């Protein structure tokens, strides 16, 4: 709950210092992971959801600025279904394409960090992401 910021920060830091050969695919997965963590938090604790949103959403302004700005207004469980960008996220799993080695690199790292928030991330990937493995 009050830990989402660390779970995601841990992931983020690992991605940021990963090998350049893996970093493009790992960065792709960051965006949906951020969004689903945020939507979950809005329902649980809007104060935390806000801080979480405002800390990490600047990372996605180049490619997803439009969707980011439409999600500022999403402050409650009611505002979730109201929002068109948020509704598009919850109604279907987010499609991503990634290497086997990358998914395994990722799942191994979250596994080794389960107690720090690894489990939470794996749970978001398992239920909100639709990986096309290549």
Structural determination approach: X-ray
For the stretch 49-56, contacts whose Cβ atoms lie closer than 8 Å and that sit 24 or more positions apart, written own/partner, are: 49/75, 50/75, 51/5, 52/4, 52/5, 52/8, 55/5, 56/8, 56/12
Q: Under a CB-based contact definition with an 8 Å cutoff, are residues 124 and 33 in contact?
A: yes
* Burial track 48-69 (b if 16+ CB lie within 10 A, e otherwise): bbbebbeebbebbeeebeebbe
**DSSP letters spanning 78-132:** HHHHH-HHHHHHHSSPEEEEE-HHHHHHHHHHHHHTGGGTHHHHHHHHHHHEEEE
CATH number, position 109: 1.25.40.500
Cα–Cα dist 134/126, whole Å: 17
Q: How many domains does the chain have?
A: 1
Q: Which structural domain range is residue 4 located in?
A: 1-134
């Amino acid at each position: 709950p009050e830990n989402y910021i660390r779970a995601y920060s841990m992931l983020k830091n690992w991605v940021d210092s990963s090998l350049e050969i893996y970093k493009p695919e790992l960065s792709y997965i960051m965006y949906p992971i951020f969004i689903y963590l945020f939507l979950n938090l809005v329902a649980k604790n809007p104060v935390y959801a806000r801080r979480f949103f405002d800390r990490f959403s600047p990372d996605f302004k180049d490619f997803h600025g439009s969707e980011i700005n439409r999600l500022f207004s999403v402050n409650s469980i009611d505002h979730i279904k109201e929002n068109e960008v948020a509704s598009a996220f919850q109604s279907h799993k987010y499609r991503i394409t990634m290497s086997k080695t990358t998914l395994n690199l990722l799942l191994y790292f979250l596994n080794e960090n389960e107690s720090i928030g690894g489990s939470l991330i794996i749970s978001v990937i398992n239920q909100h992401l639709d990986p096309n493995i290549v």
